[PDB]
């Protein structure tokens, strides 16, 4: 939530820092800075996937028990 405002404000600050100083070197560090920010969002977002991956595992264990009971009861009925 904090990173989003910063990249956006920088985008807006990079828009007018060109006019405030065209020949200044800091514009390419801002792009790089922008690139660094891009490296960060993807890096931070990827944090969720391992936890997400773990959740997928539980249903497989869970669904079979939901399936095995049905087979046993059906067999008993037959």
């Amino acid at each position: 939530r904090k990173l989003n405002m910063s990249i956006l404000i920088n985008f807006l600050d990079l828009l007018d820092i060109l006019i405030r100083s065209p020949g200044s070197i800091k514009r390419e560090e801002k792009l790089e800075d922008l690139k660094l920010l891009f490296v960060h969002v993807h890096h931070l977002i990827n944090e969720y996937r391992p936890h997400q991956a773990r959740e997928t595992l539980r249903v497989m264990m869970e669904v079979q028990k939901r399936q095995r009971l049905e087979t046993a009861e059906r067999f008993q009925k037959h």
């Binding site: 405002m5 404000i9 807006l12 828009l15 007018d16 006019i19």
Partner: protein, 60 residues
């Protein structure tokens, strides 16, 4: 090569002045278009986060 044809340099200076003025006018046009685009995008999305716009206006 301008002297080779034979002509006073006043016309050449006039042409240089008019082409530099044309370049200045198109630069002014692109500057004012990006400025008004910035202004319209700022005022268009003033409601997304009032505190962010307040801080932006304060810092300027």
């Amino acid at each position: 090569e301008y002297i080779d044809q034979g002509r006073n340099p006043q016309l050449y200076t006039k042409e240089c002045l008019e082409r530099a003025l044309a370049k200045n006018e198109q630069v002014k046009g692109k500057i004012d278009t990006m400025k008004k685009f910035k202004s319209l995008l700022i005022q268009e999305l003033s409601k997304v986060f009032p505190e962010d716009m307040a801080k932006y206006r304060s810092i300027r």
